[PDB]
């Protein structure tokens, strides 16, 4: 049996008695015991499935602890409060996560700051249907990770940033990031096989800007990466260029359908292809 009645009753009794204890303090043991009881009540409320009360207790404990010289405990309590508040209201979670990020960055470490920035960006994208703040947070996290020579996480963040920029019609940043990532991955024993894919994505962006630009970019990529001359993406793009150079839409559609039959196209690729087709 895990009925919430007893848990809630105990939690509210603890909260009330701790509030009484702290109120009487108009030497510092009172604050410590109050914070301990606040943490216990927050944990009990979390066990009771009520997240708003648990988050409020966590935030109150964090503030009380920060009242003292100790500060990292406040950061831990704030991140716990954000985790608790991720359910009901994301705004308070964002605020407390930002405060924790500020304190952690002040301390000196940055990897945890990058992780919290990633969490904030994910919250923005999922709940607030906003991309610009998510883009900024991803850029900050990528810069922080690259500062510590963390290439993989920075590359993933830059990939997400380039994708979102492409979604917003900002082609220059997308092509720059894709070229950088492809060049970086070309010189790896494991990631080498993926170096083609990124290039293709960049090439698609060129098609949006212009046609001859895309052709010249394809030539440059093939010269730089000869093995790119046998991949299916290069053949598809050559066929699309040939069809698009003579106002041929039928051949465009047949090539698109033939390639899509082997592999299903994603939303990004199909949307970009529809844009290119609508161009002419």
């Amino acid at each position: 049996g895990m009925d919430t009645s007893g848990k809630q009753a105990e939690a509210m009794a603890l909260l009330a008695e701790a509030e009484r204890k702290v109120k009487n303090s108009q030497g510092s043991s009172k604050i410590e015991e109050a914070c301990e009881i606040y943490a216990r009540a927050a944990n009990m409320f979390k066990m009771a499935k009520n997240w708003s009360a648990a988050g409020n207790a966590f935030c109150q404990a964090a503030q009380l602890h920060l009242q003292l010289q100790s500060k990292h405990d406040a950061a831990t309590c704030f991140v716990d409060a954000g985790n608790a508040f991720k359910k009901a209201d994301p705004q308070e979670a964002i605020n407390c996560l930002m405060r924790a990020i500020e304190i952690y960055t002040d301390m000196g470490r940055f990897t945890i700051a990058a992780k919290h920035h990633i969490s904030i960006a994910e919250i923005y994208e999922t709940e607030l249907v906003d991309v610009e703040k998510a883009i900024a947070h991803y850029e900050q996290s990528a810069d922080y990770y690259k500062g510590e020579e963390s290439n993989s996480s920075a590359n993933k963040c830059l990939l997400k940033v380039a994708g979102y920029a492409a979604q917003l019609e900002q082609y220059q940043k997308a092509i720059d990031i894709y070229e950088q990532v492809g060049t970086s991955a070309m010189d790896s024993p494991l990631l080498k096989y993926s170096a083609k894919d990124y290039f293709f994505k960049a090439a698609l962006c060129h098609f949006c800007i212009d046609m001859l630009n895309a052709k010249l970019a394809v030539q440059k990529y093939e010269e730089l990466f000869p093995a790119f001359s046998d991949s299916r993406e290069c053949k598809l793009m050559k066929k699309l260029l040939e069809a698009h150079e003579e106002q041929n839409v039928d051949s465009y559609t047949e090539s698109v359908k033939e390639y899509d039959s082997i592999s299903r196209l994603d939303q990004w690729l199909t949307t970009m292809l529809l844009r290119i087709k609508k161009t002419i």
């Binding site: 993989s152 494991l190 990631l191 096989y193």
Partner: peptide, 13 residues
């Protein structure tokens, strides 16, 4: 296999 390789590199770091 490609996804496997990327994630393995990340885990190693």
């Amino acid at each position: 296999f490609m996804d496997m390789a990327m994630l393995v590199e990340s885990q190693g770091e």
